[PDB]
Design a binder for this molecule. Structure first.
Ligand SMILES: CC(=O)N[C@@H]1[C@@H](O[C@@H]2O[C@@H](C)[C@@H](O)[C@@H](O)[C@@H]2O)[C@H](O[C@H]2O[C@H](CO)[C@H](O)[C@H](O[C@]3(C(=O)O)C[C@H](O)[C@@H](NC(C)=O)[C@H]([C@H](O)[C@H](O)CO)O3)[C@H]2O)[C@@H](COS(=O)(=O)O)O[C@H]1O
Ligand SMILES: CC(=O)N[C@@H]1[C@@H](O[C@@H]2O[C@@H](C)[C@@H](O)[C@@H](O)[C@@H]2O)[C@H](O[C@H]2O[C@H](CO)[C@H](O)[C@H](O[C@]3(C(=O)O)C[C@H](O)[C@@H](NC(C)=O)[C@H]([C@H](O)[C@H](O)CO)O3)[C@H]2O)[C@@H](COS(=O)(=O)O)O[C@H]1O
Ligand SMILES: CC(=O)N[C@@H]1[C@@H](O[C@@H]2O[C@@H](C)[C@@H](O)[C@@H](O)[C@@H]2O)[C@H](O[C@H]2O[C@H](CO)[C@H](O)[C@H](O[C@]3(C(=O)O)C[C@H](O)[C@@H](NC(C)=O)[C@H]([C@H](O)[C@H](O)CO)O3)[C@H]2O)[C@@H](COS(=O)(=O)O)O[C@H]1O
Ligand SMILES: *[C@@H]1O[C@H](CO)[C@@H](O)[C@H](O)[C@H]1NC(C)=O
Ligand SMILES: *[C@@H]1O[C@H](CO)[C@@H](O)[C@H](O)[C@H]1NC(C)=O
Ligand SMILES: *[C@@H]1O[C@H](CO)[C@@H](O)[C@H](O)[C@H]1NC(C)=O
Ligand SMILES: *[C@@H]1O[C@H](CO)[C@@H](O)[C@H](O)[C@H]1NC(C)=O
Ligand SMILES: *[C@@H]1O[C@H](CO)[C@@H](O)[C@H](O)[C@H]1NC(C)=O
Ligand SMILES: *[C@@H]1O[C@H](CO)[C@@H](O)[C@H](O)[C@H]1NC(C)=O
Ligand SMILES: *[C@H]1O[C@H](CO)[C@@H](O)[C@H](O)[C@H]1NC(C)=O
Ligand SMILES: *[C@H]1O[C@H](CO)[C@@H](O)[C@H](O)[C@H]1NC(C)=O
Ligand SMILES: *[C@H]1O[C@H](CO)[C@@H](O)[C@H](O)[C@H]1NC(C)=O
Lengths: 163, 321, 321, 163, 321, 163
């Protein structure tokens, strides 16, 4: 993907994280667990919902075929009529299939972007107080309990305390 | 101790296509193409379609004796006509501006039939021997029930001068016809007068028909022809007929009570006795999808037709192996 | 000490839509849809439109006496005709291939009128009593000024054999007509000859008209009908008329001096006495926008029509709250 | 946004920067101030200008309606004509509205991209000679006067001198 | 020691356009627009086109004597007709429903000519003096070879009653005509009978033509006119002719052996003696490109037409200066 | 470009790298040389190939003009016919030219993305064992022979050994 996170430096997803699209997994003396990041997840849900409705609505007004009859010495206009009706179906078929293709690609890269921005968000908090392992994980120099882990998810990781 | 950032995976096998990659497995998707139908012709919004079965529009409107089902039809949501209905013009001929009339029916939801010229009222002409073997009813020779095939009484066909004033506050579909005989001997046998005509007038119409004689192939066992014409008579306007031969008089004229969205659907299918809000010639549709791929010609509240076999939007993200 | 990287914000409230988000406030934008007009019908590039007012194209070209304004009209940028103009065919009838002729006017910017058959020149026929109450002028009965309604002189209607050679180096729009009387008694009263015809010939045209008699409803106080026909006579070609009754002769024929881009605009609106370079039936347009949403049918140098209410491009970036 | 800078790790824009789209704000003993980055700004101006003209020109040739008249027994071709003219208006209306929607989204992400690339440009110069605060700001270990600040905007920040 | 990450560059000068930037030099690209042709009219898939040269479709089918090349033509891939072919209707006239017939030829790949009425078989009428100076062959006056211009024998034109049964298991294109004389004196001179007609009947056809007299301009040295009509006679159906004057009888009728994809191409160009699988009026196409910009009207296995001058896809990346 | 690598922090391409689109250049005591990264290159080749075929196929079914003749008093339908045929050519011409424009832009940004992801991949391996120079190059604190260079291209750079 364009942003290098999904199937990239983060090699795979988490079957164990069910309550969100993006989130954190911690492991310390007390235990381990998955916690979904609500903000980034809800933002993704909104973006995709609008996109689907935006797509639906743009296609909502489009060509409609109508039945028209012609006799045996009106073959030219019968044929003109057929080509007209068929021609618009090809145009609208093309529009639909292309839009899906183009926007599907953008949707997957959108998800990739959201993961990367969340990863960088954490990276920018921790700074040189943890080791950037290279796999999506940050390994702490200090012992980091469940409140410490929560401060990272909070956005409230107190860098000066653990420095 | 460590904290990791990661993303959702699941047991989904749904795939989507993109420009650069096809069959990409995702965690969530949304199909937007309706691919199915019930396979039946059905009532639209409760309102039943006019199913002509083996009768055509011409046969119904001219009152072909095989189309006795369709005398005084109730209002219809849409009309269903086969591709090659057998019960069309029992007596060979042409229907003048048939396609233009058929197009007029796309704006019509209900006709009410009324009598403008009584069959009895032809006191100076013979009216009850205007039949042919080409239109049979219950074994006996019959004819288009809505029009009167007039012939001479006691070897004289006197000039006809009839007028009808449209006193109803509706448009009125009037139908009449001319007969084209095989030879000059049959012309005289039927109407006596060798040279004949039919003049029809309204505020707009200024017509004068003459019979064209020719040796023709037998169609439905007859080499004679009938050429049927029509007009819309506006309210408070009179139609005037004058003829000294070969005239097919109007007994009944259809009254256009309701004008709405309608369509003449082309389908071999019959009647499912089902209800729908979106109908196709292939069957009915019941979905919330924005698209379908069943058939272009639909009637009612329908999703948009596309030729695609598949339209699936990725909602989730790339799912992991 | 510190250095920061950042981006512009401002007091803008302009919003734009995107796929995933609507009403996004941006710092700069560019509207590309022209939404306004002056509400007036106007001169195009200085050149005035031919405003027929309540006259139709037929009335103007046949020289209906109510269309005296439009005798010898100057050249026009475009033509303006109402939806249902009252001054159409004063005497009831049909205009043959009227729509095809109207289409021909879309390629025409100027007619010059000329006399081909003088009204005096009918020395063997009566030419000055060819009037009706249906076309009144200043209280008296009149007629289409461009054509002569010919009648018998001293109870004889001799055969007419008239030819005109197109010596101008232009195409020539010729108009003529046939009269359809009410009954055989009126036929004889007007033209005497019971059976009549009109034969018109050119290099291409091979026509022979016959009057059709019928009882018709009174339109404009008359149940008689006039059927008008036309042709384009090419240079160095002659048109030939032969008739023993019911003939409406051409006095004048319009000469096609200029062929350019024109259009017959349909509008109830009158004249603003304004100038423009892009005109619609709703009004005129003066903008540099690439699009507008006023009306599809335009004439001149115009932006493209779309049905949108709104087209705004983001130029700047997401503006901050 | 896709690139995480605008309304992201840089929480908001600067009312105080009027002479450009992207730039720097410095603060030291001598004072503080906004300086627009000309290169990245002019590059954005060019990209957006071309885009607007590209959009205009692609739509410049498109369907034009023409008036055509039909009598009372030419209703089929009158209706064919209407559907043809209307059908093309829906196609061209759809094209215009979709293009604006798609390219508007790309325009905002373009701006987001330009800010991020400018931020990284500075980050790559400063290296470990300043603290990455996480908000778009870099806090220097050494005292950085107005010439020092200018060298960063220059592209000429002499890392080996302050290391 | 150091390791760097970097990308490919090369000596390419190929450029591509994007939304924000034009003329971007890239390392690799792919042109997808075919811009060239051989400039010749050519055999399609081995099968030669029917090149009418200066003859029209009417001239070929009526058997104009200048179109002797096109007697018993072999099967064709497509047809090539000039814009204004000189050898059209040698004798002035009209071809009834010519465009509809031309459209029928788009579904036809081969005609086989057959004789239905022998020229000798007119024992009661004169058949060999039906010629004009307007259709000359080898210096002498001739006529459309496929039809017989019948005249009176010893000052009598007796009624014609001729019927042909289509015993072939094919559709049959039948052609006939009516002659329109200059005046009543020529009518009697040619056919004697003052009032004449032609009645043609089939299972569907019910026609009766009458000659229309008019003073007409000389076209090809003649002011008389010929009006040609046609029908498709289905197998096992009979066509019936009856006429007492002015009849152009069918000698030959074309038999429709093969129905396939064909087209009437409009081109001034002649014959390159080349072979192709995609043909245009401008020339032939031989490419694997998905697009071309030569000419919209093509026949065969062709890329799609677009109006573009240039379509180039970037495959590689931005190339360095 | 959107991702800031091509013509960005990596100022220019390499004429000397002929066997791939993206790769590495090393320089040490033993020598220097170009080595193409096969994985990222083959992935780019696949993405572009599919894209070209996807584009071709979407255009493969599109309007075809047919010759139709009309007489002198059929000018309205002749004109309707012309506008219909011309109208579809403008629609399909527009589709083709726009798709090329839009997808060309995406193709160049795709390449920019692939270079950046490859650069980050290496960055994440090396961590604080090398100097991030700012130009696409990493300068090692330890001596890095051809096997050491190979481990970086491998993906197998043993950080704990050189730390
Ligand atoms: C061998 C023979 O001569 N038999 C005649 C009948 O005519 C022949 O036999 C027919 C069965 C058929 O093979 C014909 O081709 C053939 O001429 C003769 O009359 C019949 O044929 C005539 C043809 O001129 C008519 O078709 C007639 O049919 C009707 C019909 O049913 O449509 C009879 C009907 O009553 C008529 N109706 C009206 C209102 O006139 C119509 C109508 O005249 C015609 O359709 C208008 O074009 O024709 C057949 O009955 C038969 C009886 O003679 S009859 O008095 O003319 O009816 O007598 C045999 O000896
Ligand atoms: C009560 C009565 O009998 N009155 C007659 C008039 O005819 C009747 O009354 C009329 C007012 C009207 O209601 C008619 O329906 C009715 O028959 C009679 O003539 C008038 O009516 C006739 C009907 O045939 C004509 O329509 C005529 O109108 C004109 C016209 O203005 O259009 C008169 C005009 O001079 C004629 N012009 C030419 C060139 O011929 C035309 C033309 O003949 C006609 O339009 C072609 O179809 O008709 C009314 O004036 C009235 C005068 O007699 S008249 O000499 O026939 O004109 O005499 C009353 O007693
Ligand atoms: C100076 C003079 O009077 N000369 C006459 C010839 O007539 C002159 O030439 C004509 C072209 C025209 O300009 C006349 O006004 C002029 O007087 C006369 O015959 C010719 O004229 C007639 C016109 O009525 C014909 O055009 C005829 O041509 C043919 C033809 O070639 O098409 C001759 C041909 O044999 C005829 N074929 C048939 C099957 O009838 C046709 C046909 O009749 C016509 O096309 C149907 O509309 O006409 C000219 O030859 C000439 C011989 O007289 S003729 O027997 O009537 O032909 O005699 C000169 O003295
Ligand atoms: C993708 O899947 C379909 C059926 O699920 C398969 O038939 C098709 O060949 C596949 N396409 C590619 C490019 O692998
Ligand atoms: C009948 O029609 C005429 C028009 O011919 C109209 O004026 C009249 O009012 C109508 N009604 C009656 C009851 O005559
Ligand atoms: C966006 O703004 C318009 C006009 O100000 C408003 O009417 C509309 O409801 C809004 N739509 C959404 C989705 O916010
Ligand atoms: C008149 O028209 C004829 C053809 O009808 C043409 O040949 C002639 O040159 C024209 N002009 C004159 C002055 O006769
Ligand atoms: C791009 O290059 C073409 C062809 O060389 C040239 O004619 C055109 O003017 C250039 N346009 C721009 C905007 O650089
Ligand atoms: C000839 O045509 C008639 C119909 O007119 C048909 O019934 C007959 O079988 C045909 N064939 C022969 C050999 O008569
Ligand atoms: C987040 O969590 C910590 C405990 O780990 C708590 O002290 C702090 O108040 C919380 N802040 C927010 C914004 O939730
Ligand atoms: C930038 O600024 C410094 C002083 O702050 C100056 O010495 C240097 O030459 C400048 N370099 C450029 C490229 O402008
Ligand atoms: C990569 O290279 C090293 C030598 O530098 C070698 O020992 C190792 O086996 C290789 N590993 C892989 C995965 O190719």
């Amino acid at each position: 993907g364009l942003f290098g996170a999904i199937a990239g430096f983060i090699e795979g997803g988490w079957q164990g994280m069910v309550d969100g699209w993006y989130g954190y997994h911690h492991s310390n003396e007390q235990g381990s667990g998955y916690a979904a990041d609500k903000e980034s997840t809800q933002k993704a849900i909104d973006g995709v919902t609008n996109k689907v409705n935006s797509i639906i609505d743009k296609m909502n007004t489009q060509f409609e075929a109508v039945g028209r009859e012609f006799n045996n010495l009106e073959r030219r206009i019968e044929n003109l009529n057929k080509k007209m009706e068929d021609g618009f179906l090809d145009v609208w078929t093309y529009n639909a299939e292309l839009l899906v293709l183009m926007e599907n690609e953008r949707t997957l890269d959108f998800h990739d972007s959201n993961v990367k921005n969340l990863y960088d968000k954490v990276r920018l908090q921790l700074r040189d107080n943890a080791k950037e392992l290279g796999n999506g994980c940050f390994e702490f120099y200090h012992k980091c309990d469940n409140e410490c882990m929560e401060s990272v998810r909070n956005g409230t990781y107190d860098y000066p305390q653990y420095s | 101790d460590q904290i990791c950032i990661g993303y959702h995976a699941n047991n989904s096998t749904e795939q989507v296509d993109t420009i650069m990659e096809k069959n990409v497995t995702v965690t969530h998707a949304q199909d937007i193409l309706e691919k199915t139908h019930n396979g039946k012709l059905c009532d639209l919004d409760g309102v039943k379609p006019l199913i002509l079965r083996d009768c055509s529009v011409a046969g119904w409107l001219l009152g072909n004796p095989m189309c006795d089902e369709f005398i005084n039809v109730p209002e219809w949501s849409y009309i269903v006509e086969k591709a090659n209905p057998v019960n069309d013009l029992c007596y060979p001929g042409d229907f003048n501006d048939y396609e233009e009339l058929k197009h007029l029916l796309s704006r019509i939801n209900h006709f009410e039939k009324i009598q403008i010229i009584p069959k009895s009222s032809w006191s100076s002409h013979e009216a009850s021997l205007g039949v042919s073997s080409a239109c049979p009813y219950q074994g006996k020779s019959s004819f288009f029930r809505n029009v009167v095939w007039l012939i001479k009484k006691n070897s004289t066909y006197p000039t006809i001068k009839r007028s009808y004033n449209n006193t109803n506050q509706e448009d009125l579909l009037v139908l009449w016809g001319i007969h084209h005989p095989n030879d000059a001997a049959e012309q005289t046998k039927l109407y006596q007068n060798p040279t004949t005509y039919i003049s029809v007038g309204t505020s707009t119409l200024n017509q004068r028909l003459v019979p064209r004689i020719a040796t023709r192939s037998k169609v439905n066992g007859q080499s004679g022809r009938m050429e049927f014409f029509w007009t819309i008579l506006k309210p408070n306007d009179a139609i005037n007929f004058e003829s000294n031969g070969n005239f097919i008089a109007p007994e009944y004229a259809y009254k256009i009570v309701k004008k709405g969205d309608s369509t003449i659907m082309k389908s071999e299918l019959e009647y499912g006795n089902c209800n729908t809000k979106c109908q196709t010639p292939m069957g009915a549709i019941n979905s919330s999808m924005p698209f379908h791929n069943i058939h272009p010609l639909t009637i009612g509240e329908c999703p948009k037709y596309v030729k695609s076999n598949r339209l699936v939007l990725a909602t989730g993200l790339r799912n992991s192996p």
